[PDB]
DNA sequence: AATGGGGACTTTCCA
DNA sequence: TTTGGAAAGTCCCCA
């Protein structure tokens, strides 16, 4: 029940198995200490990754273990950088959590027979630990810096009257866990389109550098002040816009009345601060 | 008989004062324990600091005690995040050190009058110490953040007839310890010229900021779909450049016989990426 | 080697 | 509050 999690184990014992059902996004930035949570880790499919055993016939609900574990070019052990934590139940949390230790501290959820042996792992986060705090603490060798990659390491414990002891063990895909880079300066050099109709719904095209798949496209109006009166979005064409070329459809200007052109600007944010310098449009009257 | 270094002393009592006759360039990149040593703090002319004792008429060679402290605020003391650095008395440190301890080292030279009591400090360099290190000790120190600037600080101790030594301490400059950006992203706010004839020749004026001497400027076209189809560098009067305004001669344009109005771009760049936002020039027929 | 200069990586804070 | 989004601190490399 409390085997060593270096230990290692197999997924599948006889008519037994462990398999995740639903995996973790490959990308989770673990929080510090020093900081607030940083929430459980989510499934691609924006909900929480599924575990499940399978095979189990008794009626009896088993104890569903979580831990961190690496994934570098060795065998899998629990990492030493990173440790799970219980993202205290919250709204979203619904799978009780309990913590124990063994130096790697590790969660504690139940596998329901009535929930078919799977549960929703949405109980859990990851804590980054400090490298100085950690290295040659405990007898060590290993280093934290570049070592940010994790699994999430699940295991269960059945036991047999016969006195035996199934122990099955499974890990998720490795998991990026370092803060991804940041974002660059959009920046837009031509554009193929500098007016249209008020009705606006056509598509321009955006020459320049730093575009991505998270770009946005801003339309805006200012008052000879600077008095900003205007906001709306541009849909991009995501399945068509480069690093280069930025695919955007006109958004319907705010006032199809218009009799007189109006100008107007646009720009192209990156993330929610990197912005490209306002860009020139022209709106003219049905 | 050993006086503590948050002690309250000055630079001079009565015929006696002790001065920093050269006084130490106001940056110098400390080095951490990690990394080779970054070498002695130096004077803004490429030479070392030097420290002078007055009105001393004995002729037995003092010690002059040098460490690192505090820059702003509140009293002087030893800075709790930097530590002196002996400069490995190589053939050019033409300076004598021995160092010491006190929860803060000391190096200490030699103060001779056979050299009127003025000496070179060229072996004295700057560790900086983890935040986390100090930060962690039982003593309520203050913060590592932001808490870069530091200050050389020598003393010296007279020792008189009646047994009575007299206590002079000099405080330099302060001296910023962090690495420096050696280039920020240059950024154009506005320009005095938008139109110009193919010919170019005309000089363009360009206000903003983190302009440098380096900084350069190149005219550039581009298909669309982003061929480059034009490149030129425009020439910067290097002699009239502030740091927030450039003056560039803008390039002829690559036909000569252009009817219509021909859109192009031009940017600033610091460095060999560092480059700003793509800017919209015209060039006019004729 | 010592040298710095620059830049990638880690941890903390902030809009 | 959230938590992306830097900003400051520490460690590594040698066009």
């Given at each position: 029940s409390s085997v060593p999690l270096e230990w290692p184990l197999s997924s599948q014992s006889g008519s037994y198995e462990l398999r995740i059902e639903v995996q973790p996004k490959p990308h989770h930035r673990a929080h510090y200490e020093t900081e607030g949570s940083r929430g459980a880790v989510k499934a691609p499919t924006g909900g929480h990754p599924v575990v499940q055993l399978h095979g189990y016939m008794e009626n009896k609900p088993l104890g569903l273990q979580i831990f961190i574990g690496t994934a570098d070019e060795r065998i899998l052990k629990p990492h030493a950088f990173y440790q799970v934590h219980r993202?205290?139940?919250?709204?979203?949390?619904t799978t009780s959590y309990e913590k124990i230790v063994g130096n790697t501290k590790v969660l504690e959820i139940p596998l329901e027979p009535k929930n078919n042996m799977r549960a929703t792992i949405d109980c859990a986060g990851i804590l980054k630990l400090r490298n100085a705090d950690i290295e040659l603490r405990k007898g060590e060798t290993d280093i934290?810096?570049?070592?940010?990659r994790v699994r999430l390491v699940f295991r269960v414990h059945i036991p047999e009257s016969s006195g035996r002891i199934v122990s099955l063990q499974t890990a998720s895909n490795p998991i990026e866990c370092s803060q991804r880079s940041a974002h660059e300066l959009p920046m837009v050099?031509?554009?193929?389109?500098d007016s249209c109709l008020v009705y606006g719904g056509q598509q321009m095209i955006l020459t320049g550098?730093?575009?991505?798949?998270?770009s946005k496209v801003v339309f805006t109006e200012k008052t000879?002040?600077?008095?900003?009166?205007w906001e709306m979005e541009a849909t991009v064409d995501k399945d068509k816009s480069q690093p280069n070329m930025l695919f955007v459809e006109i958004p319907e200007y705010?006032?199809?009345?218009?009799?007189t052109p109006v100008k107007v600007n646009f720009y192209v944010i990156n993330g929610k601060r990197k912005r490209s310098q306002p860009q020139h449009f022209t709106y003219h009257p049905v």
């Open positions: 993202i205290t139940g919250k709204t979203v949390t934290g810096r570049k070592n940010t050099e031509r554009q193929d389109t550098q730093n575009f991505t798949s998270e000879t002040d600077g008095q900003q009166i705010r006032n199809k009345h218009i009799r």
